Enzyme design. Structure first.
Site, short mmCIF file in Angstrom:
data_model
loop_
_atom_site.label_atom_id
_atom_site.label_comp_id
_atom_site.label_asym_id
_atom_site.label_seq_id
_atom_site.Cartn_x
_atom_site.Cartn_y
_atom_site.Cartn_z
N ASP A 57 5.04 -8.51 -0.49
CA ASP A 57 4.14 -7.80 0.44
C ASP A 57 4.45 -8.04 1.79
O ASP A 57 3.99 -8.93 2.63
CB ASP A 57 2.71 -7.95 -0.13
CG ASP A 57 1.92 -7.03 1.02
OD1 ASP A 57 2.16 -6.40 1.77
OD2 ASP A 57 0.46 -7.34 0.59
N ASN A 79 -0.50 4.78 1.16
CA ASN A 79 -1.01 5.71 2.05
C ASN A 79 -0.43 5.71 3.51
O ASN A 79 -0.22 4.72 4.00
CB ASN A 79 -2.58 5.64 2.22
CG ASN A 79 -3.07 6.18 0.86
OD1 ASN A 79 -3.21 5.57 -0.01
ND2 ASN A 79 -3.33 7.77 0.66
N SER A 102 0.95 -1.16 0.13
CA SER A 102 -0.04 0.00 -0.08
C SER A 102 0.87 1.30 -0.01
O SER A 102 1.92 0.94 0.22
CB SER A 102 -1.24 0.17 1.17
OG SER A 102 -0.61 0.10 2.19
N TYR A 131 -9.02 -0.82 1.18
CA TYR A 131 -7.99 -1.93 0.89
C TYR A 131 -8.75 -2.91 0.26
O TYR A 131 -8.33 -4.28 0.40
CB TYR A 131 -7.15 -2.61 2.01
CG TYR A 131 -6.30 -1.25 2.48
CD1 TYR A 131 -5.38 -1.01 2.04
CD2 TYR A 131 -7.06 -0.50 3.65
CE1 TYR A 131 -4.54 0.05 2.78
CE2 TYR A 131 -6.26 0.22 4.45
CZ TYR A 131 -4.92 0.80 3.90
OH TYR A 131 -4.35 1.92 4.37
N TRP A 136 -1.81 6.77 7.34
CA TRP A 136 -3.19 7.36 8.05
C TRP A 136 -2.92 6.77 9.59
O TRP A 136 -2.26 5.76 9.68
CB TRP A 136 -4.15 6.77 7.30
CG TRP A 136 -4.50 5.44 7.41
CD1 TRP A 136 -4.22 4.42 6.24
CD2 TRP A 136 -4.85 4.64 8.39
NE1 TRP A 136 -4.51 3.06 6.92
CE2 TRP A 136 -5.32 3.22 8.04
CE3 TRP A 136 -5.65 4.86 9.77
CZ2 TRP A 136 -5.63 1.98 9.08
CZ3 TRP A 136 -6.14 3.52 10.54
CH2 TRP A 136 -6.05 2.48 10.32
#
Length: 365
Positions: free
Chosen positions: A254, A81, A79, A119, A83
């Site tokens: 990942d 972002n 990913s 997601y 947050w």
């Protein structure tokens, strides 16, 4: 060297099990990890935005604001972002987590832009703001990040993380917010346009490569599709036999997952051969005593062999041994896709190179 220490903790899944919550969830929802990677694999009914982080095991800490407010976050290569939860997050699930209070920060700058994060399994709503993020000792100024305010699902209450720090490409960032790594690079805060991950916890090394972490030479693989850290896999073998990825396939590196994930069928076959069975809490247990009698599984990448021994692919906890494999259903037209998670990284030191768009790998030390 800029090092971010990572700690290994029980997973969100383990916590759900321990509170006896997983069963009910699974009975009324169909989990498909493929939903994190394809806008098309989503759940129709998604009330648990963080479902895809059931299996994350490594966490790091960051500071945000002046003076710094701390948070535990996932360093996620799947990913882009950043947050964290806002103090305004009223939900029950926000209750025992660190939350950011913008009023307490003299460097914070609000924006009126909304953040919509997904997601693949429901969305979270929030606001974008700027502040200084403390990461690995560096002060990453003018970093845009999201503050989540709406219902994040009951899963957050049991999660060992407060938020997520994405490490992928900017092309996949929601609202095009700039990712942490790009801003560091943009501001000349790191030595080079790359980063490396060493899992024992371990460390995320920002802007460097450390020979202490591997043996042999590094092998470089080009990134095949820019967005996720996606490479071409040549084949997968199990006992000298080709078991999947015949004639080549795609793989995503990942860090936000601990498992090896692949097409349902290949997976069902592998599980059967290793002697695993699924329990109530919906886990694939295997007898720990049976480990020495299992065969290795080998991934061939750019003509090099990366074997994983049973000790690697089988997770050993408290009260149990569990299968490090999991299945997913990838969309129609999508070709065969495997996801390489912690199980793999724990054995192969990995280098993520943004300057040249390649991944490098070498056997751990």
């Amino acid at each position: 060297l800029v090092k971010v220490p990572l700690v290994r903790k029980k997973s969100l899944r383990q916590n759900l099990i321990k509170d006896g919550k997983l069963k009910d969830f699974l009975k009324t929802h169909k989990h498909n990890p493929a939903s994190k990677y394809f806008p098309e694999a989503a759940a129709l009914i998604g009330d648990e935005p963080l479902e895809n982080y059931l299996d994350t095991e490594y966490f790091g800490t960051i500071g945000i604001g002046t003076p710094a407010q701390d948070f535990t976050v996932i360093f996620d290569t799947g990913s882009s972002n950043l947050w964290v939860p806002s103090v305004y997050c009223s939900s029950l699930a926000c209750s025992d987590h660190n939350q950011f209070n913008p009023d307490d920060s003299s460097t914070f700058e609000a924006t009126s832009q909304e953040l919509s994060i997904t997601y693949g399994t429901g969305s979270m709503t929030g606001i974008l703001g700027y502040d200084t993020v403390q990461v690995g000792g560096i002060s990453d100024t003018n970093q845009i990040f999201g503050l989540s305010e709406t219902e994040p699902g009951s899963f957050l209450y049991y999660a060992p993380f407060d938020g997520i720090l994405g490490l992928a490409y900017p092309s996949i960032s929601a609202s095009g917010a700039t990712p942490v790594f790009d801003n560091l690079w943009d501001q000349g805060l790191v030595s080079q346009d790359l980063f490396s991950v060493y899992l024992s916890g371990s460390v995320v090394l920002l802007g460097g490569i450390d020979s202490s972490y591997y043996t042999g030479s590094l092998n470089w693989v080009p990134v095949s599709v820019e967005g996720y850290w996606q490479i071409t896999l040549d084949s997968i073998t199990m006992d000298g036999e080709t078991i999947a990825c015949s004639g080549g396939c795609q793989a995503i590196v990942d860090t936000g997952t601990s498992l090896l994930t692949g097409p349902t069928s290949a997976i069902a076959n592998i599980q059967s051969d290793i002697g695993a069975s699924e329990n109530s809490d919906g886990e694939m247990v295997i007898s720990c005593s049976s480990i020495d009698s299992l065969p290795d599984i080998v991934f061939t990448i750019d003509g090099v062999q990366y074997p994983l021994s049973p000790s690697a692919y089988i997770l050993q906890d408290d009260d149990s041994c569990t299968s490090g494999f999991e299945g997913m259903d990838v969309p129609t037209s999508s070709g065969e896709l495997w996801i390489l998670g912690d199980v793999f990284i724990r054995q192969y030191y990995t280098v993520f190179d943004r300057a040249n768009n390649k991944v490098g790998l070498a056997p751990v030390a």
